[PDB]
Design a protein around this motif. Structure first.
Motif: not given
Ligand SMILES: Cc1cc(C)cc(Oc2cccc(-c3c(C)nnn3C3CCN(CCN(C)C)CC3)n2)c1
Ligand code: NA
Length: 126
Positions: A27, A31, A35, A114, A118
């Motif tokens: 995760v 993520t 990006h 982000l 998360k």
């Protein structure tokens, strides 16, 4: 000259797989890695190619997502906190070396946002 990169292998070091570390790979790292602003952070800072002879005079604990990715994939860590610290070191280094409003700082800020979203849902250890 660049320094050797942070280590990603060390047989002497105790390590584990935990569900939290699995989340950090599947995760969190995934993520940030995909990006549009990940690219400067996907490998150690190459101070030679970037012409930054002072970088490693100022940044004495370098860290980057390429190193973090290898550490996760190689099960280098004992706990989630060790990995979270690596991400925070990476962001802090960027803010230490650079100046507010620089493009690189805007990029780090977007990734950090982000990251915080998360890690706020990091699962209970199980
Ligand atoms: C000119 C440029 C702009 C941008 C957005 C990225 C650039 O390439 C990369 C590639 C790998 C890492 C980094 C990096 C990290 C991590 N932290 N700092 N850096 C650089 C440090 C030097 N800066 C010089 C420009 N300042 C003086 C305004 C640029 C940022 N930058 C180069
Ligand atoms: Na560790």
């Amino acid at each position: 000259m660049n320094p050797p990169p942070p280590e990603t292998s060390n047989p002497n070091k105790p390590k584990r797989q935990t569900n939290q570390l699995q989340y950090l790979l599947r995760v969190v790292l995934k993520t940030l890695w995909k990006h549009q602003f990940a690219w400067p952070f996907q490998q150690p800072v190459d101070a030679v190619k970037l012409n930054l002879p002072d970088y490693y005079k100022i940044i004495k604990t370098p860290m980057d997502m390429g190193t973090i990715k290898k550490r996760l994939e190689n099960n280098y860590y004992w706990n989630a906190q060790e990995c979270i610290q690596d991400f925070n070191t990476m962001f802090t280094n960027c803010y230490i070396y650079n100046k507010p409003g620089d493009d690189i700082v805007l990029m780090a800020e977007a990734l950090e946002k982000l990251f915080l979203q998360k890690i706020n849902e990091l699962p209970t250890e199980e």
